[PDB]
Design an enzyme around this catalytic site. Structure first.
Site, PDB file in Angstrom:
ATOM      1  N   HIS A 239      -9.485  -2.362  -7.445  1.00 58.44           N
ATOM      2  CA  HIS A 239      -9.433  -1.171  -6.545  1.00 58.44           C
ATOM      3  C   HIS A 239      -8.632   0.162  -7.875  1.00 58.44           C
ATOM      4  O   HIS A 239      -9.361   0.969  -8.522  1.00 58.44           O
ATOM      5  CB  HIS A 239      -8.632  -2.106  -5.476  1.00 58.44           C
ATOM      6  CG  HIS A 239      -8.622  -0.778  -5.085  1.00 58.44           C
ATOM      7  ND1 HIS A 239      -8.991   0.470  -4.760  1.00 58.44           N
ATOM      8  CD2 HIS A 239      -7.407   0.020  -4.047  1.00 58.44           C
ATOM      9  CE1 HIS A 239      -9.265   1.520  -3.884  1.00 58.44           C
ATOM     10  NE2 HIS A 239      -8.032   1.070  -3.150  1.00 58.44           N
TER      11      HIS A 239
ATOM     12  N   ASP B  39       1.073  -1.281   0.193  1.00 55.28           N
ATOM     13  CA  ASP B  39      -0.288  -0.357   0.115  1.00 55.28           C
ATOM     14  C   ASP B  39       0.374   1.287  -0.096  1.00 55.28           C
ATOM     15  O   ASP B  39       1.466   1.108   1.111  1.00 55.28           O
ATOM     16  CB  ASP B  39      -1.112  -0.086   1.112  1.00 55.28           C
ATOM     17  CG  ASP B  39      -2.072   1.410   1.546  1.00 55.28           C
ATOM     18  OD1 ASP B  39      -2.231   1.198   0.192  1.00 55.28           O
ATOM     19  OD2 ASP B  39      -3.001   1.720   2.687  1.00 55.28           O
TER      20      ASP B  39
HETATM   21  C1  HEM Z   1      -9.845  -1.529   2.407  1.00 56.32           C
HETATM   22  C2  HEM Z   1      -9.491  -0.388   2.637  1.00 56.32           C
HETATM   23  C3  HEM Z   1      -8.132  -0.262   0.849  1.00 56.32           C
HETATM   24  C4  HEM Z   1      -7.337  -0.493   1.026  1.00 56.32           C
HETATM   25  C5  HEM Z   1      -6.811  -2.300   1.161  1.00 56.32           C
HETATM   26  C6  HEM Z   1      -6.400  -0.280  -0.350  1.00 56.32           C
HETATM   27  C7  HEM Z   1      -5.632  -0.978  -1.367  1.00 56.32           C
HETATM   28  C8  HEM Z   1      -4.591  -0.701  -2.131  1.00 56.32           C
HETATM   29  C9  HEM Z   1      -3.591  -0.781  -2.553  1.00 56.32           C
HETATM   30  C10 HEM Z   1      -2.682  -2.190  -2.066  1.00 56.32           C
HETATM   31  C11 HEM Z   1      -3.567   0.094  -3.717  1.00 56.32           C
HETATM   32  C12 HEM Z   1      -1.964   0.175  -4.461  1.00 56.32           C
HETATM   33  C13 HEM Z   1      -1.238   0.378  -4.176  1.00 56.32           C
HETATM   34  C14 HEM Z   1      -0.070   2.086  -3.627  1.00 56.32           C
HETATM   35  O1  HEM Z   1      -0.264   2.331  -5.452  1.00 56.32           O
HETATM   36  O2  HEM Z   1      -1.266   2.404  -3.319  1.00 56.32           O
HETATM   37  C15 HEM Z   1      -3.997   1.232  -3.476  1.00 56.32           C
HETATM   38  C16 HEM Z   1      -4.002   2.149  -4.159  1.00 56.32           C
HETATM   39  C17 HEM Z   1      -5.190   3.400  -4.292  1.00 56.32           C
HETATM   40  N1  HEM Z   1      -6.465   3.378  -3.033  1.00 56.32           N
HETATM   41 FE1  HEM Z   1      -6.957   2.220  -2.009  1.00 56.32          FE
HETATM   42  N2  HEM Z   1      -6.893   0.480  -0.517  1.00 56.32           N
HETATM   43  C18 HEM Z   1      -8.206   1.154   0.117  1.00 56.32           C
HETATM   44  C19 HEM Z   1      -9.319   2.183   0.233  1.00 56.32           C
HETATM   45  C20 HEM Z   1      -8.597   2.714  -0.476  1.00 56.32           C
HETATM   46  C21 HEM Z   1     -10.141   4.121  -0.002  1.00 56.32           C
HETATM   47  C22 HEM Z   1     -11.319   4.239   0.623  1.00 56.32           C
HETATM   48  C23 HEM Z   1      -9.312   5.124  -1.214  1.00 56.32           C
HETATM   49  C24 HEM Z   1      -9.758   6.920  -1.835  1.00 56.32           C
HETATM   50  C25 HEM Z   1     -10.813   7.498  -1.457  1.00 56.32           C
HETATM   51  C26 HEM Z   1      -8.433   4.401  -1.706  1.00 56.32           C
HETATM   52  C27 HEM Z   1      -7.248   5.301  -2.950  1.00 56.32           C
HETATM   53  C28 HEM Z   1      -6.287   4.728  -3.759  1.00 56.32           C
HETATM   54  C29 HEM Z   1      -6.084   4.769  -4.682  1.00 56.32           C
HETATM   55  C30 HEM Z   1      -5.965   7.235  -5.519  1.00 56.32           C
HETATM   56  C31 HEM Z   1      -4.576   4.601  -4.717  1.00 56.32           C
HETATM   57  C32 HEM Z   1      -3.207   4.528  -6.160  1.00 56.32           C
HETATM   58  C33 HEM Z   1      -4.379   4.413  -7.298  1.00 56.32           C
HETATM   59  C34 HEM Z   1      -2.897   4.710  -8.307  1.00 56.32           C
HETATM   60  O3  HEM Z   1      -3.921   5.531  -8.941  1.00 56.32           O
HETATM   61  O4  HEM Z   1      -2.082   3.775  -9.130  1.00 56.32           O
HETATM   62  N3  HEM Z   1      -7.747   3.620  -1.626  1.00 56.32           N
HETATM   63  N4  HEM Z   1      -4.966   1.103  -2.488  1.00 56.32           N
END
Ligand code: HEM
Ligand SMILES: [Mg+2]
Length: 301
Positions: free
Chosen positions: A216, A144
């Site tokens: 996601h 993450d």
């Molecule tokens: C259980 C809750 C969540 C988990 C386990 C999770 C996990 C992750 C993972 C594994 C990534 C990919 C690695 C990274 O680029 O950081 C990611 C990306 C991202 N997540 Fe989440 N996330 C969660 C909730 C959220 C929520 C609620 C939002 C926004 C409201 C969010 C927004 C993002 C964004 C903007 C990215 C970057 C995507 C990109 O541009 O490639 N996430 N998240």
């Protein structure tokens, strides 16, 4: 004749954090002195523990911020609505305290200072202790942070309001997730990867036309005429191994708009499809807060 950002928005790679969410019990006046004492305490802790690389943020919910600001600025601020007709619940509180540093023990002293400053003026609803896990992975086992804005310059561009009355301030979103790792473990690793949009072990992005629209990354990597809707995440794992555990989600943005667009996408309000992560984890809290600039906390009186 300029504004200073609160110290907890921009730091990267902090290994630990404390989030306190609370309701106002009496006259909103109580929050003026408390907030000034609290930012003064933070300065004191930064002086005593320079190697902790400590930062903190005090942020306010719509109703109390409207009272403290006299209705000026914070134009996008509103109570957190329910998304997906309830898929995303809403638990809007009045005050958010975010503490992050290289040392949990320092964070803990800072949290006690926060509670002493505000005292019986607040009703604490949530206190979560976040910790960075091995390889910066979520408890699901996926890294993450990879595409999070990197470097002070880009993080300021994304998170900090640039001019007018709110210059130096930021909008904050907090949402606590409870992971069901038993359910996750029933899923094959290739199914998990298609759910996230990245490979698990090596953390390689899966092309947008290879992964389902419910992945996601397909839900949150959004562009408006080629311009990404970026946010600065400060989320961390939390919980016990035998009890409740998950991700405490936390994000900062100059514009509440970027966060809301991603929530409408994830929770089915945009195209009727929802985030595949809901197959193993769910959100149980939700709130929006306004983080004023440090000097606005000093012009509270
Ligand atoms: C259980 C809750 C969540 C988990 C386990 C999770 C996990 C992750 C993972 C594994 C990534 C990919 C690695 C990274 O680029 O950081 C990611 C990306 C991202 N997540 Fe989440 N996330 C969660 C909730 C959220 C929520 C609620 C939002 C926004 C409201 C969010 C927004 C993002 C964004 C903007 C990215 C970057 C995507 C990109 O541009 O490639 N996430 N998240
Ligand atoms: Mg991308």
């Amino acid at each position: 004749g300029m504004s200073q950002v609160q110290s907890g928005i921009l730091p990267e790679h902090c290994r630990a954090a404390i989030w306190i969410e609370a309701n106002l019990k009496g006259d909103v006046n109580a929050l003026r002195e408390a907030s000034k004492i609290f930012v003064d305490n933070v300065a004191t802790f930064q002086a005593k523990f320079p190697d902790a690389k400590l930062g903190a943020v005090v942020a306010f919910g719509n109703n109390v911020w409207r009272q403290l600001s006299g209705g000026e600025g914070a134009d996008e601020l509103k109570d957190f609505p329910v998304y997906g007709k309830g898929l995303a619940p809403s638990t809007q509180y009045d005050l958010l305290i975010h503490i992050l540093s290289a040392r949990h023990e320092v964070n803990f002293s800072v949290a006690q200072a926060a509670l002493a400053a505000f005292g019986d003026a607040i009703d604490v609803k949530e206190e979560i202790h976040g910790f960075r896990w091995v390889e910066e992975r979520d408890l699901s086992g996926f890294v993450d942070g990879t595409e999070n804005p990197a470097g002070e310059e880009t993080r300021r561009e994304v998170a900090v309001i640039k001019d007018g009355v709110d210059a130096g301030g930021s909008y904050v979103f907090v949402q606590r997730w409870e992971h069901n790792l038993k359910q996750l473990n029933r899923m094959s690793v290739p199914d998990q990867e298609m759910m996230i949009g990245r490979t698990k072990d090596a953390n390689e992005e899966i092309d947008g036309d290879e992964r389902p629209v419910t992945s996601h990354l397909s839900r949150v990597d959004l562009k408006e005429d080629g311009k990404g809707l970026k946010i600065v995440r400060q989320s961390l794992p939390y919980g016990t191994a035998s009890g409740t555990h998950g991700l405490y989600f936390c994000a900062y943005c100059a514009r509440l708009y970027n966060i809301e667009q991603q929530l409408l996408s994830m929770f089915g309000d945009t195209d009727g499809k929802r985030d595949a992560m809901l197959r193993f984890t769910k959100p149980v809290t939700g709130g929006y807060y306004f983080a004023p600039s440090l000097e606005r906390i000093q012009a509270l009186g």
